[PDB]
């Protein structure tokens, strides 16, 4: 059939004109297949034959379907497509299982010849004109244009989906207790009716579909339904079965695929880790290239295989209960979380591993994870969860106040699931009486990359060292590290590097810079550190005396 | 009869992704849009409209209100609302004893939008878990939030106000987006009485809080007065003046850092010099006044920087070229995001009164955090542009109170 629904108005991009490509001469047997196919399409209304006038044309080709001797009709709409207006995005975003509700009965209807069942804007049809060439091109070809959404044309998915949405409206409105998800040419229908009342509703749906031009193959499975990588059952869900190969040798390709499968399994299997495997993927190697698994990667692989052996499932969402989200520190930079409404029946799980910057601490990362989980929740359930976090209220509020960025997390509670997130050192807020004042300074030469880092103290100690192929910012870090390793448990440090000061007063407990990690271990060992800044070259006492020596 | 509206040449309409929304806000938007539809304000659109602009719901008062984020559209229509016709900003406004802000957004709902421009005002109501296609609309009437609407209603607005303006020549009324700003030097009771009077004119054409721009004074960089001074105290002092030197002509530091000689313990006390004593005195005299050499340039964007100072205190500066402060200030009186949100609306309001322009904000927060939450506390019908920055920790120190 061809749906009685109104057409969608379609135009070409504002500058442009319709396609005018010349038809390539075709093999005699492709011409023959094309005539057969087109004759059948033309009898169903899909296409109408035309004669110039119509000045447009787009090339048609024909391929033999697999080994099985059917021919398919290919049109190449490249040029019409480059010339066609943009459409709204079909529907960007697909449902997550953790967000679905339980259903007693589900059925999957697929729409026959979906695109060819929807009419094309009458005014636009001429631009779809194509030509079956005569044998060896010797006489004029047979010319058609589409009356329906062509396969391969830019507008088809969007217009089909909008048509189906308009056609589903009345049925959704008259049947609020039943639910229908649209995707491409499939319809996914679910209800809390018993098989009998439900099958009856399906038939009213099909009847309603067919009233509108859309056939749905008749009444010939049960759960589980395989859907978008998932396995859906009436009151639970899991990912579709994951199989991790056994191999003595892993190619870049094998490892990429394994990380993808593991990442996918991490939606419901708690505590999957991929850090060690992912480090293998670092660098510039060929897909076919074999990568020896390091020891940590080999253990991580094991740890995961241990998690994957027996199946796990998630449950569906009950709109009448709160969502609880719990987070644990896993590896380093690795965070894992579970979301449930009844402990501990997870609606789903997840990973967070992102690094924001070169230097961070656990408190900052935990907050970022909380932010990522909050957004995921808005999307999946339409509200934010109550959190349970391995951080003390006192720790959190000590960080939030003293830090210079604004932050905020929704309702949360401490939960004692070590490792607990802590601040590993605090910087003093006032100069320390009786602590040696180290005036530090670092400076590098621009074209030599040769630097000096050093200090003078009020107690008369002095020291300068040479550094090779360094930057100005590294030497300033070097100077501060120097002062930390040569001082007692209490020490005041005066620098002129806002760079160095920015990093350290942020209170990092982890960094990509080795130097910075050295400074950090050093900061944890101290009992008191006060860090101060002065303007350089402004002739400040201690500054322009360790600046003069460096 | 509608006014023809053109985009800026070479630019296509807005294509901005709809932010995810909570259940309650989506419900409120469906309700509202179902009503605006039945009234003809907006109509359902099909997939042949590719454009999109984000929408949100805000809580004014317990009543949901729809808010359309037209920042992209406004930016892509800018030629139209700024320099064809366009609305003069009165210098007198910032000088009045009292300015009252009146929402007149309802006025646009009664004016048709140019049929060929409607498609650019498309927006989408999303669904939870992406389970159904978003609900899609465009506008048939002048939309609240679009800078084109006041530009277009301008002519009608001065007809509505002519009687009242003629009868009270000392009152300044300025339109910006959805709001009317009304300023007088009357005593507060007489001022309020006149606002009521104005409300009554408004009411005949279909329209059913208080600022005191005088009480707006600079927040100077302040130099502490102190009993005694430590080396550390002097060094902070020198750095704050050093940086003020970047802004204020005449700042002097020389005979102050003379005190910081050799390498001294941070905690050691050092006596105050005749010389120095005069400097910070004269520097204070300087920091008290407006910056010599800095003037507003109307062809340039305003920028606002904000610093979190702690204990619910926030400092801000408004400039066009960094360090050339047109204005500095503070906001005070504990959710960080809520406070930042309030501060941004306050600063945006003053900026509207003073320059008839909204600043682009440099916000001291995480992009992702701001976006989740600002909706919860936002109460204005406009939205300024913003980016996200890490406050240079020293800048925070030099603006502390
Ligand atoms: C009906 C349906 C089937 C399949 C498919 N395939 C996939 C989707 C996205 C479906 O839509 C919905 N399904 C459910 N629950 C659900 C419950 C059990 C089973 C099973 N078994 C499947 C889906 N809740 C919704 N709100 C929507 Br909308």
Curated annotation (Swiss-Prot), chain B:
Changing residue 295 to F: Confers resistance to delavirdine and nevirapine. Changing residue 62 to N: Confers resistance to lamivudine and stavudine. Signal peptide: none annotated. Changing residue 94 to Q: Confers resistance to efavirenz. Changing residue 207 to F: Confers resistance to ph-AZT and zidovudine. Changing residue 183 to S: Confers resistance to efavirenz and nevirapine. Changing residue 183 to A: Confers resistance to efavirenz and nevirapine. Changing residue 81 to G: Confers resistance to pyrophosphate analog PFA. Mg(2+) 1 binds at residues 103, 178-179. Changing residue 61 to Y: Confers multi-NRTI resistance. Changing residue 177 to T: Confers resistance to abacavir, didanosine, emtricitabine, lamivudine and zalcitabine. Changing residue 172 to D: Confers resistance to efavirenz, tivirapine and trovirdine. Changing residue 70 to L: Confers multi-NRTI resistance. Changing residue 61 to N: Confers multi-NRTI resistance. Residues 39-211 form the Reverse transcriptase domain. Changing residue 99 to A: Confers resistance to nevirapine. A motif (Tryptophan repeat motif) lies at residues 370-386. This is p51 RT. It comes from Human immunodeficiency virus type 1 group M subtype B (isolate HXB2). The gene is gag-pol. The chain holds residues 593 to 1016 of 1435 of the full protein.
